[PDB]
Amino acid sequence: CFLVGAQLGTELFIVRQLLQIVKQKTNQNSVDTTLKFTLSALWNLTDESPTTCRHFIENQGLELFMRVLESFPTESSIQQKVLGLLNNIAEVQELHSELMWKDFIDHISSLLHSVEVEVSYFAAGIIAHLISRGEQAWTLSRSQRNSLLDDLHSAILKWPTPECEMVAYRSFNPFFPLLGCFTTPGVQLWAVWAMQHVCSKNPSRYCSMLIEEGGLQHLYNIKDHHTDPHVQQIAVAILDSLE
Amino acid sequence: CFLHVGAQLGTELFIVRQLLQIVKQKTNQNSVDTTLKFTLSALWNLTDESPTTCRHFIENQGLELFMRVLESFPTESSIQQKVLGLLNNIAEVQELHSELMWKDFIDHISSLLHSVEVEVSYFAAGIIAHLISRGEQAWTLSRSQRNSLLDDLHSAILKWPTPEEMVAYRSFNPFFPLLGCFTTPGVQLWAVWAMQHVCSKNPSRYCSMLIEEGGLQHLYNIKDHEHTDPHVQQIAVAILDSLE
Numbered sequence: 001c002f003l004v005g006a007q008l009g010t011e012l013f014i015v016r017q018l019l020q021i022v023k024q025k026t027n028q029n030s031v032d033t034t035l036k037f038t039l040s041a042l043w044n045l046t047d048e049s050p051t052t053c054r055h056f057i058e059n060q061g062l063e064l065f066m067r068v069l070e071s072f073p074t075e076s077s078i079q080q081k082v083l084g085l086l087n088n089i090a091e092v093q094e095l096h097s098e099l100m101w102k103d104f105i106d107h108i109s110s111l112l113h114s115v116e117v118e119v120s121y122f123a124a125g126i127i128a129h130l131i132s133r134g135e136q137a138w139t140l141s142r143s144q145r146n147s148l149l150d151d152l153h154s155a156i157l158k159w160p161t162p163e164c165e166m167v168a169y170r171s172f173n174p175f176f177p178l179l180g181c182f183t184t185p186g187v188q189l190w191a192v193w194a195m196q197h198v199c200s201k202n203p204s205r206y207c208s209m210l211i212e213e214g215g216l217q218h219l220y221n222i223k224d225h226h227t228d229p230h231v232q233q234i235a236v237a238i239l240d241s242l243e
Numbered sequence: 244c245f246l247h248v249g250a251q252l253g254t255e256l257f258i259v260r261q262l263l264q265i266v267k268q269k270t271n272q273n274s275v276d277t278t279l280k281f282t283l284s285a286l287w288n289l290t291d292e293s294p295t296t297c298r299h300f301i302e303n304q305g306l307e308l309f310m311r312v313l314e315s316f317p318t319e320s321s322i323q324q325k326v327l328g329l330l331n332n333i334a335e336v337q338e339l340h341s342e343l344m345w346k347d348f349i350d351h352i353s354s355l356l357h358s359v360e361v362e363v364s365y366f367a368a369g370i371i372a373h374l375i376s377r378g379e380q381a382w383t384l385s386r387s388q389r390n391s392l393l394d395d396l397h398s399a400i401l402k403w404p405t406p407e408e409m410v411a412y413r414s415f416n417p418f419f420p421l422l423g424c425f426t427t428p429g430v431q432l433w434a435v436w437a438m439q440h441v442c443s444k445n446p447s448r449y450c451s452m453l454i455e456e457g458g459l460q461h462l463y464n465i466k467d468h469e470h471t472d473p474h475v476q477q478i479a480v481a482i483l484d485s486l487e
Contacts, residue, residue, distance in 0.1 A: 001291060001328055001331050001332050001335070001369070001410055001411075001412060002287060002288050002291040002328070002410070002411050002412075002413075003284060003287065003288070003325075003328070003410070003411060004411040004445070004448075006284065006288065006411070007288050010281075010284055010285040010288045010289075013281045013282075013284075013285055014258055014262075014285060017261070017262075017265065017278075017282075018258075018261075021261065034261075037254070037257045038257075038261075040246050040250065040253075040254055040257075041254040041257055041258060043244075043245060043246055044245045044246060044250055044251050044254050045254075047244060047245040081246070084244055084245075084246065087244045088244050091244075122244075125244070165247070167244055167245075167246075168244075168245045168246065168247050168248045168250070169244060169245075170245070202248075205248070
């Protein structure tokens with residue numbers, strides 16, 4: 001029992017209502033369980049869902065998430081939930097335009113050099129999906145675009161094995177376009193590191209998934225292509241863990 | 244990209260918790276605004292076919308809240324509708340039968356059962372229908388109220404006009420147990436009336452669904468059950484001949 005096709009605007013109402021909970025919490029500098037949950041709620045709702053990403057931007061979720069970063073510069077887990085939702089937005093190619101914003105990129109480049117890999121990993125992701133889209137869709141500066149490409153690659157190699165799995169994925173599909181961005185190794189580097197990371201932490205879930213969705217061929221494509229050593233290194237490791 | 248595996252369930256129960264807070268606030272302020280009826284819809288939708296969120300509703304005092312809503316806004320029928328329709332979802336969950344046996348609650352439903360708007364009394368009928376269908380042994384409250392309620396159910400349905408669609412369904416399954424309740428014909432009468440309503444205003448979607456889910460069997464079973472309430476039997480053949 002419910003009221004036909006009336007569930008479409010309840011989830012958009014929900015996004016609107018959680019955003020207000022973020023504002024009222026940021027307003028009060030109240031890093032509490034409720035704020036953390038609301039941030040997690042927003043993250044999961046945007047998962048595999050470009051309509052929710054759009055609603056998040058249509059009500060001013062970027063501006064607000066910016067101001068969230070700024071109000072809680074040392075709260076590692078806050079940042080993570082913020083950047084995680086923002087990684088989902090980085091995935092939607094139509095919304096790429098509305099992330100072309102140096103105040104937003106300046107926040108992401110900052111958190112790329114976090115000593116917490118949990119934080120820096122999601123920053124890296126946002127960067128890789130944005131650099132993935134080529135020089136011609138980067139409406140911002142090319143001194144920053146080239147500089148983040150370098151910082152992204154060098155950052156990944158500073159990363160320890162993390163203790164627990166840091167992220168869940170329902171599908172590996174968004175990674176495949178990054179696997180073929182040979183001109184930008186840091187974008188491929190992030191992709192392979194992450195696949196390796198979830199496949200070593202939770203193979204029972206992710207090896208079957210990676211294989212079924214057609215991942216091996218992309219990985220094999222890297223194995224034989226002049227390619228970046230590090231990217232090729234992680235590449236053959238994942239492969240050999242199955243072949 | 245999401246937080247962890249299975250995190251989605253934990254954030255659905257949080258949304259229910261937060262939404263109920265917006266209810267509690269708006270009722271505190273005697274405010275009947277857009278957000279409140281949006282919140283009430285959202286809670287209604289979330290309980291559709293989700294025994295789990297329904298149980299979460301109960302465990303976060305949703306019932307006592309919702310009846311504060313009822314007691315604080317007696318004239319706002321569209322509000323009462325959203326409240327009872329959710330409660331109708333809850334009534335559909337057998338493991339929650341104990342929680343709805345609150346005398347203050349049943350007393351209020353029974354009031355709205357006799358409301359003037361079918362858009363409000365329909366859902367109250369649904370709550371009462373589903374409750375009586377679990378039998379005498381399960382009714383832990385006034386055996387007399389239960390026998391009065393069973394007649395009043397039957398009465399208030401027969402006085403109902405044909406609306407201009409109050410409710411939607413994704414399945415007919417929760418009705419089918421009611422179509423068997425021969426000793427309790429009010430229950431049966433609510434089911435076939437409800438079934439007939441949605442089939443008559445949206446046949447393309449509901450008539451098929453009824454058939455796919457094996458509805459005709461239950462209907463034809465009432466047809467050749469020799470000693471069925473004539474009002475129930477009539478609506479049932481009305482439904483059947485609307486396909487046969």
